[PDB]
Design a protein around this motif. Sequence first.
Motif, PDB file in Angstrom:
ATOM      1  N   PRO C   5      52.479  49.505  88.601  1.00  0.00           N
ATOM      2  CA  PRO C   5      51.595  50.605  88.180  1.00  0.00           C
ATOM      3  C   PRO C   5      50.409  50.124  87.349  1.00  0.00           C
ATOM      4  CG  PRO C   5      53.515  50.539  86.775  1.00  0.00           C
ATOM      5  CD  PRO C   5      53.713  49.447  87.796  1.00  0.00           C
ATOM      6  N   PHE C   6      49.630  49.200  87.916  1.00  0.00           N
ATOM      7  CA  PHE C   6      48.420  48.749  87.241  1.00  0.00           C
ATOM      8  C   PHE C   6      47.340  49.821  87.224  1.00  0.00           C
ATOM      9  CE2 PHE C   6      50.195  44.502  88.208  1.00  0.00           C
ATOM     10  CZ  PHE C   6      50.119  43.956  86.944  1.00  0.00           C
ATOM     11  N   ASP C   7      47.385  50.772  88.161  1.00  0.00           N
ATOM     12  CA  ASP C   7      46.419  51.865  88.150  1.00  0.00           C
ATOM     13  C   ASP C   7      46.556  52.703  86.885  1.00  0.00           C
ATOM     14  OD1 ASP C   7      44.287  53.272  89.194  1.00  0.00           O
ATOM     15  OD2 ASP C   7      45.542  54.633  90.373  1.00  0.00           O
ATOM     16  N   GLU C   8      47.794  52.941  86.443  1.00  0.00           N
ATOM     17  CA  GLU C   8      48.014  53.718  85.228  1.00  0.00           C
ATOM     18  C   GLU C   8      47.480  53.002  83.995  1.00  0.00           C
ATOM     19  OE1 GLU C   8      52.136  54.644  84.959  1.00  0.00           O
ATOM     20  OE2 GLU C   8      52.260  55.516  86.972  1.00  0.00           O
ATOM     21  N   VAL C   9      47.427  51.674  84.027  1.00  0.00           N
ATOM     22  CA  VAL C   9      46.958  50.899  82.883  1.00  0.00           C
ATOM     23  C   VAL C   9      45.446  50.736  82.905  1.00  0.00           C
ATOM     24  CG1 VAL C   9      47.119  48.682  81.703  1.00  0.00           C
ATOM     25  CG2 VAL C   9      49.168  49.707  82.712  1.00  0.00           C
ATOM     26  N   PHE C  10      44.894  50.298  84.038  1.00  0.00           N
ATOM     27  CA  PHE C  10      43.469  49.988  84.091  1.00  0.00           C
ATOM     28  C   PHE C  10      42.617  51.250  84.142  1.00  0.00           C
ATOM     29  CE2 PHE C  10      45.230  45.938  85.580  1.00  0.00           C
ATOM     30  CZ  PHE C  10      44.483  45.049  84.832  1.00  0.00           C
ATOM     31  N   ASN C  11      43.073  52.271  84.867  1.00  0.00           N
ATOM     32  CA  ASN C  11      42.290  53.477  85.101  1.00  0.00           C
ATOM     33  C   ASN C  11      42.754  54.658  84.254  1.00  0.00           C
ATOM     34  OD1 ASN C  11      40.347  52.549  86.996  1.00  0.00           O
ATOM     35  ND2 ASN C  11      41.884  52.615  88.633  1.00  0.00           N
ATOM     36  N   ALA C  12      43.419  54.397  83.131  1.00  0.00           N
ATOM     37  CA  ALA C  12      43.839  55.475  82.249  1.00  0.00           C
ATOM     38  C   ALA C  12      42.626  56.183  81.656  1.00  0.00           C
ATOM     39  CB  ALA C  12      44.730  54.937  81.131  1.00  0.00           C
ATOM     40  N   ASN C  38      39.355  39.290  91.871  1.00  0.00           N
ATOM     41  CA  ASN C  38      38.150  39.495  92.664  1.00  0.00           C
ATOM     42  C   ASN C  38      37.442  40.804  92.344  1.00  0.00           C
ATOM     43  OD1 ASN C  38      38.782  37.075  93.947  1.00  0.00           O
ATOM     44  ND2 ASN C  38      39.812  38.092  95.665  1.00  0.00           N
ATOM     45  N   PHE C  39      38.003  41.628  91.462  1.00  0.00           N
ATOM     46  CA  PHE C  39      37.361  42.877  91.067  1.00  0.00           C
ATOM     47  C   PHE C  39      36.148  42.559  90.201  1.00  0.00           C
ATOM     48  CE2 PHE C  39      37.532  47.294  89.220  1.00  0.00           C
ATOM     49  CZ  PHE C  39      37.379  47.939  90.433  1.00  0.00           C
ATOM     50  N   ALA C  40      34.956  42.705  90.776  1.00  0.00           N
ATOM     51  CA  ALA C  40      33.731  42.411  90.036  1.00  0.00           C
ATOM     52  C   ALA C  40      33.539  43.262  88.783  1.00  0.00           C
ATOM     53  CB  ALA C  40      32.522  42.547  90.970  1.00  0.00           C
TER      54      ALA C  40
HETATM   55  C1  LIG Z   1      41.118  51.788  89.528  1.00  0.00           C
HETATM   56  O1  LIG Z   1      40.168  52.622  90.213  1.00  0.00           O
HETATM   57  C2  LIG Z   1      39.311  51.921  91.125  1.00  0.00           C
HETATM   58  C3  LIG Z   1      38.324  52.934  91.654  1.00  0.00           C
HETATM   59  O2  LIG Z   1      38.793  54.257  91.434  1.00  0.00           O
HETATM   60  C4  LIG Z   1      38.328  55.126  92.486  1.00  0.00           C
HETATM   61  O3  LIG Z   1      37.899  56.350  91.943  1.00  0.00           O
HETATM   62  C5  LIG Z   1      38.915  57.110  91.247  1.00  0.00           C
HETATM   63  C6  LIG Z   1      38.238  58.376  90.747  1.00  0.00           C
HETATM   64  C7  LIG Z   1      40.149  57.389  92.133  1.00  0.00           C
HETATM   65  O4  LIG Z   1      39.828  58.348  93.126  1.00  0.00           O
HETATM   66  C8  LIG Z   1      40.643  56.087  92.794  1.00  0.00           C
HETATM   67  O5  LIG Z   1      41.639  56.437  93.749  1.00  0.00           O
HETATM   68  C9  LIG Z   1      39.482  55.358  93.483  1.00  0.00           C
HETATM   69  O6  LIG Z   1      39.927  54.153  94.101  1.00  0.00           O
HETATM   70  C10 LIG Z   1      40.158  51.283  92.219  1.00  0.00           C
HETATM   71  O7  LIG Z   1      39.317  50.564  93.114  1.00  0.00           O
HETATM   72  C11 LIG Z   1      41.183  50.347  91.593  1.00  0.00           C
HETATM   73  O8  LIG Z   1      42.036  49.823  92.605  1.00  0.00           O
HETATM   74  C12 LIG Z   1      42.022  51.085  90.549  1.00  0.00           C
HETATM   75  N1  LIG Z   1      42.930  50.163  89.886  1.00  0.00           N
HETATM   76  C13 LIG Z   1      44.112  49.803  90.398  1.00  0.00           C
HETATM   77  C14 LIG Z   1      44.915  48.837  89.581  1.00  0.00           C
HETATM   78  O9  LIG Z   1      44.514  50.238  91.473  1.00  0.00           O
END
Ligand SMILES: *[C@@H]1O[C@H](CO[C@@H]2O[C@@H](C)[C@@H](O)[C@@H](O)[C@@H]2O)[C@@H](O)[C@H](O)[C@H]1NC(C)=O
Lengths: 124, 213, 187, 218
Positions: C5-12, C38-40
Amino acid sequence: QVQLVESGGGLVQPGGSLRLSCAASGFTNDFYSIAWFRQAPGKEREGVSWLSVSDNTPTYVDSVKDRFTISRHNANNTVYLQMNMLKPEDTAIYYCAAGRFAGRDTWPSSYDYWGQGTQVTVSS
Amino acid sequence: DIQMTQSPGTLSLSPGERATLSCRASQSVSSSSLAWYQQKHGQAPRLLIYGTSSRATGIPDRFSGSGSGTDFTLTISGLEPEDFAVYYCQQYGSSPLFGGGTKVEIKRTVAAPSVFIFPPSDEQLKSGTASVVCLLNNFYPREAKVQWKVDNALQSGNSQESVTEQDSKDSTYSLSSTLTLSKADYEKHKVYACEVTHQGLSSPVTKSFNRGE
Amino acid sequence: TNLCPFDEVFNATRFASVYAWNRKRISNCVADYSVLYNFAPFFAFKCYGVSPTKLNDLCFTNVYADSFVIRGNEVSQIAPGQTGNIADYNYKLPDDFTGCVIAWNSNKLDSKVGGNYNYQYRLFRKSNLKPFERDISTEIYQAGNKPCNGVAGFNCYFPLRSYGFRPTYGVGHQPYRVVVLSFELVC
Amino acid sequence: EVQLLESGGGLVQPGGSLRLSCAASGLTVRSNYMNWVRQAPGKGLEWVSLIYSGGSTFYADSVKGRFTISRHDSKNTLYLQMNSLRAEDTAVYYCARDLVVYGMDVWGQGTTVTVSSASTKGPSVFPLAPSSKSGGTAALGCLVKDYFPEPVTVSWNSGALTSGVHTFPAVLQSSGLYSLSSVVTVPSSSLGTQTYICNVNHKPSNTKVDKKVEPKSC
Ligand SMILES: *[C@@H]1O[C@H](CO[C@@H]2O[C@@H](C)[C@@H](O)[C@@H](O)[C@@H]2O)[C@@H](O)[C@H](O)[C@H]1NC(C)=O
């Protein structure tokens, strides 16, 4: 005993090329990273290209992505920055930086070793 | 790296006037990270203001500060005599960094300098050296130009200057300039002169003496 | 098996103040780490004791994901062996730290016209933190020999201070969100 | 009064060492950010070194590798160890307690560090007499030349003559020795009626000189 010798730089017309070099010496292993910073006359010191030596991974900012090419020749322990399709926005003093980590960072304060810095100008 | 530039280098005002001192940062910083200091001549600095606008303990009401980002300002609403000093701004990064400082001096009407020239004493000549002193007494403003002429030849490289602080009574400056020669070189010439140019002088005043007269 | 669940951490939506830094224990999941490198938009991605492109070929007992917000010119303090306000009194990494430090500018999220004063940091502390120690005490700091009795004053200072992020600050005083990945011996 | 008492300043030859001290009274050095800030003659304040209460030290680029800040908790005293001193290190060094967001509120009185190859030498006092040629105001003085180190003290007529006296800041000559002058403007009428004597005291060299200044006669 880490010394960064950087050379190169000069004046070229819009669309010309120019290669900078940075001979890194003094490191005891391959766990370090090189960064190329540039500094416009009145602006700040910004990173444009990175190279993590241990895993050989380059990184470019978007404004130079298809134009710059960072690389390292393992023989002479030198990192090169081939700058093609140079634009007037590339005019700056270019520095070579080295940090004790595997990766990249946009902050000059994250890099402990620096080259002398050289001028690169693109004519109007 | 950040840089703090204070302007003007010197501020010339009368007592009771409003002083505005500028402090510019090369990068936009938060207002909580900037302070002002005062330093009278011969004394240690003292904290005037912290966090751009907060007045330090015991600092009189007339001192105020404002600004944000890159431009900060110290304001003195009505200068008192004790307020004429040097003021430094200081920003907090990873370490403190001071600006160049701004001296606030007393502005008065223009006063021309009184010029005196002093030949070397016969006591000093027995040592082997000759010092010729030129005195500029009680002038304003501080900017003055002294030029040594030996036998009408402009002398450069063998003189040193010293200026006093602003006088407590008349708010003027005094300048002393010393021309140093060897006794042998001193005896090789006759007319020793210092020419003084100042705003209060319509034409440069020259005071001179002939050696051995 | 599911992704980590890196999305919960990075995109909180909101991060924590650095003195009360958050920690997320990561276990029982698969993680693609080279995609993270590779995420710029990751302005900083510095690893210690390990090359980033090698993480995908290693397993570990637990991964810890620490996150917080600091100012721009404090990001250099998030590294082993660093000193200063943040590295000594807020978030300290051990000298033998094995992991990666990830940071990016969050001016568009954590800055606010007029100031965002929710993010705080510890300015006054008597001694340095131990590595990975979280200190959330708000006791009045005693700067002299007289006790404070919980009352602020001269030589008696509240230990926390707000950043007050504004969108018009320079990058050095703009907010940066940091994610420190530590590896404890998820693949 | 909350104070910071400084000492340790003196004369150091280039390449030598010197340790400054800063004894606090009214605040605990161990518990505070502490700074050393110096001021070269006639120039601005320069932050030099900082120590955290936690032990971390920071130094200006101009003193890196040569200076070391430290403290003794039992003596409540801050220290600055200076090695490989250069001529540009000559300054007045201050210590200050740092509250960061509340500024540096407590300042030491300062202690002077002079980096020079010169040795202690008493001055020569020569009279500055008006040449034989004379307006309404006359000027005479004393030249206090070739001494080291600072300072000297000059009075006129044993302190009875203060109005119109200008004692100038000394200048450092290329020989390494200081030199200043002290002048006084008197009404030209009182040249032939009032005796004028300058009293020069240079404590570092046990040099007390009284010089009567007279108009030079042909
Ligand atoms: C974090 O989010 C990055 C971009 O987010 C994008 O926009 C938001 C509003 C959501 O709709 C999301 O689903 C979209 O992808 C992603 O590229 C990145 O992978 C995310 N971080 C992780 C660890 O997955």
